[PDB]
Design a protein around this ligand. Structure first.
Ligand SMILES: [Zn+2]
Ligand SMILES: [Zn+2]
Ligand SMILES: [Zn+2]
Lengths: 66, 71, 258, 59, 47, 105, 115, 54
RNA sequence: UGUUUUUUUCUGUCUCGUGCC
C-alpha cells in the first residue's frame, strides 16, 4: 500500500526514495538507469521500487470530510 | 431548518446531490425545470472537478502523468 | 599454543561504507565478527510509541511499525545511554531514553507527506537522518485527517529486532580464487571472476593448495546512515571483547566456587 | 452506478475496480452460479445398454 | 457528564446521542454514524 | 435488539453486579455506558463486546469475543435495521505476525 | 499467541547460570562446558582457539535445539593440562587478539583520513 | 485498571490487569497478542480519567 | 478504659454452503 522503510532482504533505507524514483522516471530517465542513479546496487533492494504497488492513493480518494 | 440555510454541496453529499438532481430532472417533464436541473448538475460536476484538481494537484496528478508516459 | 597477529588495511573509506581487509586470522573469528556486525551492535531506535489521535487511513499499529524502522544517528549517544531494562528509575528517563514528538494535521487542500522531518526530538544530536536526499516518508494525510503522537527511543541490538540493525549488508568474502576447494565448480569456465580476484583472465581458478589456511578476509560493511561504518566496526569489536570478558569472569567464579 | 464516473464511486464509498454483478440480500453478497444443462429442442440418440432398449431418441 | 458523542456517516459532524433516542444526525438526517476514539492510554510497541 | 415478547425486551446497558441475575465472570467496565466498546481498546478471549441486557431483574444476553482471538477494535458503527431497532456492527483487527506453521505458497 | 519474546535470547533468567562445568566419566580429563543464552558467535571462536592449542586433544561445540538458547562445548586435553585452564587461556588470548585488532584498525582508520 | 510495568524485562509496556492475586497478577499487553504473569510489585497504576465533565 | 461487611458455572435450537489434510 505504501513504500516500506527498509528492504526486507538487505535492510537499506528505501522509504526515502520512492518520490525521487518517480521524479527521475518523470524527467527522462528510465528504470534501469534510475535504479543505479539512486544508489541501488544489489538486486534485492531493486524490487522495492519495481514491485511496489502504490495503493495509498486509492485509499486517500475516500476522504472522510470535504 | 438546518438545510434551509445551509448550502447543500458541502461536503460528502456531492454524488448524492448530483443523483437527486438527475432524478428530479428525469422525473420533471417541463422544459425550464429540466434545463435548470441540468445546469445545476453541470455546475456541481464542475465544482467537484475543480475541488479534486485542487486536492489532486500534487502526487495524485504526477503519478497519473508518470504512469501515462511510462505506458 | 597462542593466537595470531592479524593485520588490517582499509581500501576505501567513505561516509556510507568501508572496504577493509583482515589478514592472518581464523575463519571463525571473521564469521563471528560479521555476525556481530549484523546482530550485536548497540544503536538507538524507536521502541515505544504512544498514539493519541490517528485519523489516517492506515492501521493504528502501522504508524508504530514504520516509526520503528526510521534510523537515528547515535554517533556519540549510544555509548552514553544505558539499556532501559537495566535502568534504576521509572518512566523513560532522558538519561536512558530519547523523547520524540509528531503533530501534523493536513489543513490545506493538497495532500501532506508526513516525513521523518516532523519527528521533533528533544535532544539535538539524536535526530533522524536529515542533517546532510529526501526524508523517510511515514504516511500521507489528506485535508481533514491528523496524526498526533509521541514516542521514546532506547538502545538495542539486532538480535532483539531488526530495527537495531545498523549495517545494510555485509559483503563477506575470502579466498576469491577457489584455491582451498571449499566450493567445487562443475564448470569453472562458466563462472565470472570475483571482484578481488588476482588471477589473470586465462586461467579459470587457482590450482589446489593442500597446506593452506583461509586468510585475507574481505569486508564491505555498509552503514544504513545511523552509525558510521568504522564506528560500527569499533562498537562490534568492543562488544565482542566485553562478552568475552564477562564469560571469563563467570568461568572464573564458577571454578572458584567448585 | 450505471455508467458513473470513478469520482462519484469514490465519493459513494465504492471503487471503480469492483466487477459488480452480485445481488445484496440482507447485507450479503449473493452470486448466481451459471448452471449448465442439456440443450433443448435437439434430438439425442443414446445407446443405453443397461436397459431393454438398444437405442433411445431423447429430445 | 458524558453525552455519548458520536460522528455522522457522511457529514462527519459531531452529534450528541443519549439512550432511548433515534440515531440521526443533527442536520440533513441520515441513519449511519460511528463512534469516537477512546480516551484510554493507547500505547503500542514499535516491534 | 428486538422485541422478543410482551414482557421480554432487549436494550443496550452495562450489566451491573446487582440488578442483573444472569451474568458472566468477565470484565464489564471496559466498555462505555452505552454498551458498545470504544474503538482502539484492548479485548481478549471471553471479553464482553456489547452491553445487551434483556429484562425478565435483567439477563446478560450479550455476546463475547471468541476464545483465542486477542485483537483490537477498529471502529464501531450504529444504525437501524429495516425493522427500526438499534443495529450495530463491530469489527476487531489483529496484527498477525508471520510465525512458523503459517501456510505459504 | 505463545511466540516467545525477544529478550530471552541474551538476557539471563533468575536462577539460571551463565556457565556450568560438568566432568565427563567416559574418558579422563574431559569436561563439558554448558553456556546459557548464547549462540554460535561465542562458541565458534572458542572452538577454533582451542583447536590452535596442541595440548587440547578434543574440542567442539553444538546446539541442542535451535529454538532453545544453549550450547555445550566439550573439551579434552592431556592429563597434565586441565581443560579449565585451557578454556581460560583461550578466552584470555582471544581477548588480547581482539584488542590488538581493534588498535590496528583504529590506527589504520586515523591514518586513512587525510594521510 | 490500566497499569504500567516499571521494572523487569517488560519495562515500558501498557496493559490491563486481568486476574490479580496476593503476589502475582496477570496483565494483558497492549501491543502484543499475549498475556503474561508479572509480579504485582512490578506494576504501577497509571489510570485513565477525564477531568472536567462540564 | 474500645476495634462495622461473605453472594458465584454459566449455555441456545434446526438447516444449507465453502475451504483444507
Ligand atoms: Zn535489497
Ligand atoms: Zn531511566
Ligand atoms: Zn441526521
Amino acid at each position: 500500500m505504501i513504500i516500506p522503510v527498509r528492504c526486507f532482504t538487505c535492510g537499506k533505507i528505501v522509504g526515502n526514495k520512492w518520490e525521487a524514483y518517480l521524479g527521475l522516471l518523470q524527467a527522462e530517465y528510465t528504470e534501469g538507469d534510475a535504479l543505479d542513479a539512486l544508489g541501488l546496487k544489489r538486486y534485492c533492494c531493486r524490487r522495492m521500487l519495481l514491485a511496489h504497488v502504490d495503493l495509498i492513493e486509492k485509499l486517500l480518494n475516500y476522504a472522510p470530510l470535504e | 431548518e438546518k438545510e434551509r440555510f445551509r448550502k447543500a454541496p458541502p461536503n460528502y453529499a456531492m454524488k448524492k446531490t448530483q443523483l437527486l438532481k438527475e432524478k428530479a430532472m428525469a422525473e420533471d417533464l417541463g422544459d425550464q425545470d429540466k434545463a435548470k436541473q441540468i445546469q445545476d448538475q453541470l455546475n456541481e460536476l464542475e465544482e467537484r472537478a475543480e475541488a479534486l484538481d485542487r486536492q489532486r494537484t500534487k502526487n495524485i496528478s504526477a503519478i497519473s502523468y508518470i504512469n501515462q508516459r511510462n505506458r | 599454543p597462542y593466537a595470531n597477529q592479524p593485520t588490517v588495511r582499509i581500501t576505501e573509506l567513505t561516509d556510507e561504507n568501508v572496504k577493509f581487509i583482515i589478514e592472518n586470522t581464523d575463519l571463525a573469528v571473521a564469521n563471528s565478527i560479521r555476525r556481530v556486525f549484523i546482530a550485536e551492535v548497540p544503536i538507538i531506535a524507536i521502541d515505544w510509541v504512544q498514539i493519541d489521535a490517528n485519523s489516517s487511513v492506515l492501521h493504528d499499529e502501522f504508524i508504530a511499525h514504520r516509526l520503528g524502522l526510521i534510523p537515528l544517528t547515535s554517533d556519540d549517544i549510544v555509548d552514553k545511554l544505558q539499556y532501559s531494562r537495566d535502568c534504576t528509575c521509572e518512566e523513560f528517563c532522558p538519561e536512558c531514553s530519547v523523547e520524540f514528538t509528531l503533530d501534523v494535521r493536513c489543513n490545506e487542500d493538497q495532500t501532506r507527506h508526513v516525513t521523518s522531518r516532523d519527528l521533533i526530538s528533544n535532544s539535538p544530536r539524536v535526530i533522524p537522518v536529515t542533517s546532510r536526499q529526501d526524508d523517510i516518508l511515514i504516511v500521507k494525510l489528506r485535508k481533514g485527517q491528523e496524526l498526533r503522537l509521541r514516542a521514546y527511543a532506547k538502545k538495542g541490538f539486532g538480535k532483539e529486532h531488526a530495527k537495531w540493525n545498523p549495517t545494510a549488508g555485509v559483503a563477506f568474502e575470502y579466498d576469491p580464487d577457489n584455491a582451498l576447494r571449499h566450493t567445487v565448480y562443475p564448470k569453472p569456465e562458466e563462472w565470472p571472476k570475483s571482484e578481488y580476484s588476482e588471477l589473470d583472465e586465462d586461467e579459470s581458478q587457482a590450482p589446489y593448495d593442500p597446506n593452506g589456511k583461509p586468510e585475507r578476509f574481505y569486508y564491505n560493511v555498509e552503514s544504513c546512515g545511523s552509525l558510521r561504518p568504522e564506528t560500527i566496526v569499533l562498537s562490534a569489536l568492543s562488544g565482542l571483547k566485553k562478552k568475552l570478558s564477562d564469560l571469563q569472569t563467570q568461568l572464573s567464579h564458577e571454578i572458584q566456587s567448585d | 452506478l450505471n455508467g458513473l464516473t470513478d469520482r462519484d464511486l469514490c465519493e459513494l464509498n465504492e471503487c471503480p475496480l469492483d466487477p459488480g454483478g452480485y445481488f445484496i440480500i440482507n447485507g450479503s453478497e449473493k452470486v448466481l452460479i451459471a448452471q449448465e444443462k442439456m440443450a433443448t429442442n435437439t434430438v439425442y440418440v443414446f445407446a443405453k445398454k443397461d436397459s431393454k432398449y438398444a437405442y433411445t431418441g431423447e429430445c | 457528564q458524558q453525552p455519548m458523542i458520536y460522528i455522522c456517516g457522511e457529514c462527519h459532524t459531531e452529534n450528541e446521542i443519549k439512550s432511548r433516542d433515534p440515531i440521526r444526525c443533527r442536520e440533513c438526517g441520515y441513519r449511519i454514524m460511528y463512534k469516537k476514539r477512546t480516551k484510554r492510554l493507547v500505547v503500542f510497541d514499535a516491534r | 435488539e428486538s422485541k422478543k415478547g410482551f414482557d421480554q425486551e432487549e436494550v443496550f446497558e452495562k450489566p451491573t453486579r446487582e440488578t442483573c441475575q444472569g451474568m458472566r465472570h468477565a470484565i464489564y467496565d471496559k466498555l462505555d455506558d452505552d454498551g458498545l466498546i470504544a474503538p482502539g481498546v484492548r479485548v481478549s478471549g471471553d471479553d464482553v463486546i456489547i452491553g445487551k441486557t434483556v429484562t425478565l431483574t435483567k439477563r446478560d444476553c450479550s455476546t463475547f469475543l471468541r476464545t483465542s482471538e486477542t485483537g483490537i477494535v477498529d471502529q464501531v458503527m450504529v444504525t437501524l435495521n429495516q425493522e427500526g431497532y438499534k443495529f450495530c456492527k463491530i469489527r476487531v483487527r489483529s496484527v498477525r505476525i508471520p510465525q512458523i506453521g503459517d501456510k505459504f505458497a | 499467541m505463545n511466540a516467545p519474546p525477544a529478550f530471552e535470547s541474551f538476557l539471563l533468567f533468575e536462577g539460571e547460570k551463565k556457565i556450568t562445568i560438568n566432568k565427563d566419566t567416559k574418558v579422563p580429563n574431559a569436561c563439558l562446558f554448558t553456556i546459557n543464552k548464547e549462540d554460535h558467535t561465542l562458541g565458534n571462536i572458542i572452538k577454533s582457539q582451542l583447536l590452535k592449542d596442541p595440548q587440547v586433544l578434543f574440542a567442539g561445540y553444538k546446539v541442542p535445539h535451535p529454538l532453545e538458547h544453549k550450547i555445550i562445548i566439550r573439551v579434552q586435553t592431556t592429563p597434565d593440562y586441565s581443560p579449565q585452564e585451557a578454556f581460560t587461556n583461550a578466552i584470555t588470548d582471544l581477548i588480547s587478539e581482539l584488542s590488538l585488532l581493534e588498535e590496528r584498525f583504529r590506527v589504520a582508520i586515523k591514518d586513512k583520513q587525510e594521510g | 485498571q490500566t497499569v504500567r510495568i516499571s521494572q523487569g524485562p517488560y519495562k515500558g509496556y501498557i496493559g490491563v490487569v486481568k486476574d490479580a492475586t496476593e503476589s502475582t497478577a496477570r496483565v494483558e499487553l497492549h501491543s502484543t497478542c499475549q498475556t503474561i504473569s508479572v509480579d504485582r510489585q512490578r506494576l504501577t497504576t497509571v489510570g485513565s480519567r477525564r477531568p472536567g465533565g462540564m
